[PDB]
Design a protein around this ligand. Structure first.
Ligand SMILES: CC(=O)N[C@@H]1[C@@H](O[C@@H]2O[C@H](CO)[C@H](O)[C@H](O)[C@H]2O)[C@H](O[C@@H]2O[C@@H](C)[C@@H](O)[C@@H](O)[C@@H]2O)[C@@H](CO)O[C@@H]1O
Ligand SMILES: CC(=O)N[C@@H]1[C@@H](O[C@@H]2O[C@H](CO)[C@H](O)[C@H](O)[C@H]2O)[C@H](O[C@@H]2O[C@@H](C)[C@@H](O)[C@@H](O)[C@@H]2O)[C@@H](CO)O[C@H]1O
Lengths: 306, 307
């Protein structure tokens, strides 16, 4: 059958699948107190996209649609009636948690809303700084609408609009919680069509994440976002569609200069990596190294500890 | 063991512009009289050699990274940004590049948001300034390692590590958007260096076929159009595959995979751009399910059926 492969891309050549930013660290953690169930950056090793995952970096935490008329709400002064980022009409009966690329954390996403060109406006006339909070009860993307909180400039009513994400905001009552899913249809309604939760299934193992330090626009602290596989892997697996020969592919992080293995890991067919490690640490790698497919193994392959 | 050349299986709605971070909206053709088509982003030879300021990530296209320094007291560029490459690698002007990777490659105002040191302020959007980066500014000298920032929303902080995230294009009274005019990467007294070569049809009768995006227009009255030679996914694909080019021209077919039918043929030049036998400025309509498929290697003289 068609051989499974990983793209030859170093850590500085990878993009986060859950926020449009370069990967800057590998990271591991027990995450004891959380269900790790992201919806972006979800794709099986044989190329099946899941959750809200799609192929473009530009659609991740992006939104597109028609703005409403003004609301009475102090925070969400306008609603956005969603379409998919590729422009396709969105039907809530679709097999998805929400439109593709929808943010998959509880917290405040910051970015810029652009709408109808403004012939007469001054500088930045058609670019509004906007907060999209996934703890708002107006955050109901499954139903086809989310709330917009303007923070710089003024949102125009009833216009075709685009939201380009820039960063994360944290205010007094909205911590950034990357492993808590939004309520895609609002509180007291169940989420649907989710990519499954992930985690280790062999003693002494933890998930290894691809991590990005992303812009922090309010709150004062650095913000970290972990994805299970980078966007380029999503793209690669979708292109290749190599049949998975077992539940686990043994991969090695290799230094191409020396041919030496920095460490080995298990890449599960569902699309996440586990390593033999304990505790919350970065995993240090040579800038020129990258994962290489070694062989198909099983869930009991005993990894060399890090 | 000869690696065959291929194109990725991605329809028009699954492609990204290689000159601005936005999805491809249309295929578009033009004679482009009066201009030199010599973009520096989205440049990659069919055998996988990145050229100009081209790199691999969508997120680095038209992005900047570096340190601001002190206030310039200048009217427009109130701060300067001292650049490193988008991946954080230190940049040295003697590198064989036109400018740091991802540097904008048109003459116009690029608008986006500068984020810096997280701030103590409790203000919303405290650490996020709307900024204009004009590639016609005398302070736009990325080859020399520095560009000018013109704040338009908020205040830029001095002496801080900074990221510019692109959002769109601005047009004001004296800075029209000219997608095919190159910045002077070292200022107007100095030649550009290390450029990916200009491109065009070898013969009258042919025109370049572009992958086109409508991108946000944050000031000015018109929608903004940006054309690239190949989409970012092709840059990435050729880089990965590194299939040797067997002649100067790869004959390709826009096919509908559902029916097997060829919509049109085209010439994919080894330099990394497409020509078709066409005349006039027009979109080229394709089926949503379709995509280019490699056919065979041919020569410069291959005569396409005129559209
Ligand atoms: C800045 C601030 O503290 N505003 C609170 C407000 O909290 C905000 O509510 C928004 C939605 O309307 C977003 O959820 C923001 O992230 C959040 O900061 C708060 O609103 C209440 O609390 C939140 C979590 C939502 O559950 C709301 O539905 C809810 O009404 C109100 C009321 O407590 O006070 C301030 O306005
Ligand atoms: C808002 C405005 O029109 N300012 C005028 C200058 O144009 C801007 O200059 C900055 C750089 O300082 C930048 O290029 C912007 O894109 C312009 O809008 C103008 O500068 C002169 O004209 C520019 C196009 C540019 O070539 C620059 O190098 C040149 O000095 C000056 C001078 O006429 O006047 C300002 O009112």
């Amino acid at each position: 059958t068609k051989p499974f492969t990983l793209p030859i891309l170093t850590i500085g050549e990878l993009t986060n699948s859950r926020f449009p930013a370069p990967i800057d660290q590998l990271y591991t953690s027990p995450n004891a107190d959380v269900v790790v169930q992201p919806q972006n950056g979800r794709c099986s090793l044989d190329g099946e996209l899941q959750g809200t995952t799609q192929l473009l970096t530009t659609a991740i935490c992006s939104y597109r649609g028609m703005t409403s008329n003004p609301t009475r709400d102090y925070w969400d002064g306008h609603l956005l009636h969603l379409v998919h980022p590729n422009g396709a009409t969105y039907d809530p009966t679709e097999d998805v948690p929400a439109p593709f690329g929808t943010q998959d954390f509880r917290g405040i996403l910051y970015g810029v809303l652009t709408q109808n060109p403004r012939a007469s406006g001054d500088e930045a006339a058609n670019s509004q700084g906007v907060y999209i909070s996934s703890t708002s009860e107006k955050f109901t993307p499954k139903l086809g609408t989310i709330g917009l909180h303007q923070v710089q400039g003024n949102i125009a009513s009833n216009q075709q609009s685009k939201f380009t994400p820039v960063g994360i905001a944290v205010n007094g009552n909205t911590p950034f919680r990357q492993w808590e899913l939004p309520n895609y249809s609002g509180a007291l309604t169940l989420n649907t069509n989710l990519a499954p939760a992930v985690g280790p299934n062999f003693p002494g193992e933890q998930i290894l994440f691809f991590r990005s330090n992303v812009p922090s626009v309010q709150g004062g602290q650095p913000i970290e976002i972990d994805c299970l596989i980078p966007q380029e892997w999503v793209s690669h697996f979708y292109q290749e569609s190599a049949p998975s020969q077992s539940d686990v592919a043994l991969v090695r992080y290799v230094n191409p200069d020396t041919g030496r293995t920095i460490f080995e890991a298990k890449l599960h067919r569902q699309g996440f990596i586990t390593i033999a490690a304990t505790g919350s640490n970065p995993v240090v790698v040579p800038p020129n190294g990258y994962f290489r497919f070694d062989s198909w193994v099983n869930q009991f392959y005993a990894l060399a500890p890090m």
